[PDB]
Design a protein around this ligand. Structure first.
Ligand code: AN2
Ligand code: CL
Ligand code: CL
Length: 386
């Protein structure tokens, strides 16, 4: 009976349930409404979600993340060759050409396919829903990026089956976000919808058309390597240079543990800067036992990220051009992804669309799961959300 919607994200995943026409986004064990798409292996245990992300800096080789970048891909693909520089964990090619992620678990070398790592994240999301409901959950709708090919979609579905889920359907992330806002029902005439999705690792812009409850993806564009992690890197690079000026040229970047600890604090300061004018980046005993402290204003963060923020409009202009339509023809702009909380990004999009207010009532890092939950309820025979 019970069907859930799961946003299986690059950096974070989210699970929702639509009951009685209302959608509940389910908080995990730590009270978090999203769960990191991280799986770690230690001498004693297999950690998933928050616990895995929290020990990543102390166990880099055996903490897996970004499996969505490998799922359904052949190890020889150029995107794998390029992305692998960003991973402290080992990835090798199997005889079937599939990527094999190599970790140490309980003193033993273990290998996993990307869909096996994703199945562990999906199993955690299934368990999050089950703890909340107090009952087993078998059915699910899982979302994927609109550009995912047949191999990537099938491997995502296989990850669901391995997790014990009966995958009712694989749907597109931009379409799930549009469904969450009821843009398929509220209109009932021709509607052009722009989905602006800026997450932790990726940026996706999708232009949809909705005529008579039917969504079609007209054009997609973005940058598979632009996200919140790149804005954190701008703060890291600044702090590394600031530490040099304060401590006689000492280079924090030569110690990978110092960089990871600094990156953790840079990301926290960035989030604070979305609702405050200032934030403090503090790392006690950062490098060579030296304490680090700096105050970052929202203006300085906006300056370091100025080009990256402005360049988010380029894929917007590209989808409009590909779809042969003017920006004035866009009926709704939906903000998806945790990075859309950055005020400067919201302002740039509003100004680009001539003052039009974007749809951001649903927590942007929850809108995809929210729409998947609605679709899961419809596919289960529940018409209450209509
Ligand atoms: N309040 C905030 N301001 C700025 N960025 C924020 C934020 N809350 C979350 N984020 C960012 O959102 C990114 C995660 O986006 P999210 O939509 O959850 O994940 P995903 N798997 O789709 O990439 C992270 O880089 C995080 O720093
Ligand atoms: Cl249900
Ligand atoms: Cl309940």
């Amino acid at each position: 009976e019970v069907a859930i919607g799961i946003d299986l994200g690059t950096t974070y995943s989210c699970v929702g349930i639509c009951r009685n026409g209302v959608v509940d986004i389910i908080a995990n064990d730590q009270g978090n409404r999203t769960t990191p798409s991280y799986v770690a292996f230690t001498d004693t245990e297999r950690l998933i979600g928050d616990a895995a992300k929290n020990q990543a800096s102390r166990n880099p080789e055996n903490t897996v993340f970004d499996a969505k970048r490998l799922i359904g891909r052949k190890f020889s693909e150029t995107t794998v060759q390029s992305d692998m520089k960003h991973w402290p964990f080992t990835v090798k090619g199997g005889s079937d050409g599939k990527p094999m992620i190599e970790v140490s678990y309980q003193g033993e070398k273990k290998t996993f396919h990307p869909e096996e790592i994703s199945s562990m994240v999906l199993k955690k999301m299934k368990e999050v829903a089950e703890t909340y409901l107090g009952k087993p959950v078998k059915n699910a709708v899982i979302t994927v990026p609109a550009y995912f090919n047949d191999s990537q979609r099938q491997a995502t579905k296989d990850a669901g089956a391995i997790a014990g889920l009966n995958v009712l359907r694989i749907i597109n992330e931009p379409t799930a976000a549009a469904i969450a806002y009821g843009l398929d029902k509220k209109g009932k005439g021709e509607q052009n919808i722009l989905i602006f999705d800026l997450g932790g690792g990726t940026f996706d812009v999708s232009l949809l058309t909705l005529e008579d409850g039917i969504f079609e993806v007209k054009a997609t564009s973005g940058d598979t390597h632009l996200g919140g992690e790149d804005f954190d890197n701008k703060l890291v690079n600044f702090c590394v240079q600031d530490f040099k000026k304060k401590n006689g040229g000492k280079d924090v970047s030569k110690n990978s543990k110092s960089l990871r600890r600094l990156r953790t604090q840079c990301e926290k300061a960035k989030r604070v800067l979305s609702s405050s004018a200032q934030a403090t980046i503090e790392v006690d005993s950062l490098f060579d036992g030296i304490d680090y402290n700096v105050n970052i204003t929202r203006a300085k963060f906006e300056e370091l990220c100025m080009d990256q923020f402005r360049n988010t409009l380029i894929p917007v202009e590209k989808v409009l051009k590909d779809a042969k339509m003017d920006k004035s023809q866009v009926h709704e702009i939906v903000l998806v992804g945790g990075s859309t909380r950055i005020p400067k990004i919201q302002q740039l999009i509003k100004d680009f669309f001539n003052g039009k207010e974007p749809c951001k009532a649903i927590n942007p890092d929850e809108a995809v799961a929210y729409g998947a939950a609605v679709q899961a309820a419809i596919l289960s025979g529940d018409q209450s959300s209509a």
